[PDB]
Amino acid sequence: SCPVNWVEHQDSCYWFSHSGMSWAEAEKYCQLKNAHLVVINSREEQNFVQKYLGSAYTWMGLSDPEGAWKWVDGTDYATGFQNWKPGQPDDWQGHGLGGGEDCAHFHPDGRWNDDVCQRPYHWVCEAGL
Numbered sequence: 142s143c144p145v146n147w148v149e150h151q152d153s154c155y156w157f158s159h160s161g162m163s164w165a166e167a168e169k170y171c172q173l174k175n176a177h178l179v180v181i182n183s184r185e186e187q188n189f190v191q192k193y194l195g196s197a198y199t200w201m202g203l204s205d206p207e208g209a210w211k212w213v214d215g216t217d218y219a220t221g222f223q224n225w226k227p228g229q230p231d232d233w234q235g236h237g238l239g240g241g242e243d244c245a246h247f248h249p250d251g252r253w254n255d256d257v258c259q260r261p262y263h264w265v266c267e268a269g270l
């Protein structure tokens with residue numbers, strides 16, 4: 142059902158990187174594989190993904206560059222599953238790299254943070270069946 146190097150869970154296929162990329166390069170990579178950065182739709186999917194994270198910060202398909210949080214596939218953010226770290230998202234500017242923080246990633250414990258999109262983090266692709 143899933144292609145080789147992809148993991149099947151509950152009607153999605155997932156691919157977990159062994160490397161890091163900026164958020165935009167990871168979403169380009171997922172799109173080239175007819176997929177997208179992972180969209181977390183439920184607690185059960187959050188638990189599956191967080192269980193197999195490669196012990197490093199990992200991008201997901203959630204960003205707010207135009208001002209509101211959006212999932213790459215159009216899943217509604219505000220009515221959807223959320224799993225932020227305490228005090229996140231904060232759009233922090235104190236990194237001094239310019240602007241705030243517009244891309245969401247997993248901490249190893251599975252809780253989410255907004256960070257600078259240009260950081261090379263691991264990522265997860267997802268595609269339907």
Ligand SMILES: [Ca+2]
Pocket residue numbers: 159
């Ligand atoms: Ca590898």
Ligand SMILES: [Ca+2]
Pocket residue numbers: 153179180181182186267
């Ligand atoms: Ca999903």
Ligand SMILES: [Ca+2]
Pocket residue numbers: 150189
């Ligand atoms: Ca499961």
Ligand SMILES: [Ca+2]
Pocket residue numbers: 205206232241242243244255
């Ligand atoms: Ca932001």
Ligand SMILES: [Ca+2]
Pocket residue numbers: 248249250
């Ligand atoms: Ca952490």
Ligand SMILES: [Ca+2]
Pocket residue numbers: 229230231232233242254255256
């Ligand atoms: Ca943050």
Ligand SMILES: [Cl-]
Pocket residue numbers: 223224225
């Ligand atoms: Cl939350």
Ligand SMILES: [Cl-]
Pocket residue numbers: 240241242243244256257258259
């Ligand atoms: Cl950013």
Ligand SMILES: [Cl-]
Pocket residue numbers: 260261
């Ligand atoms: Cl960095």
Ligand SMILES: [Cl-]
Pocket residue numbers: 176267268269
């Ligand atoms: Cl899809």
Ligand SMILES: [Cl-]
Pocket residue numbers: 153267268269
């Ligand atoms: Cl999907």
Ligand SMILES: [Zn+2]
Pocket residue numbers: 177214267268269
């Ligand atoms: Zn999808």
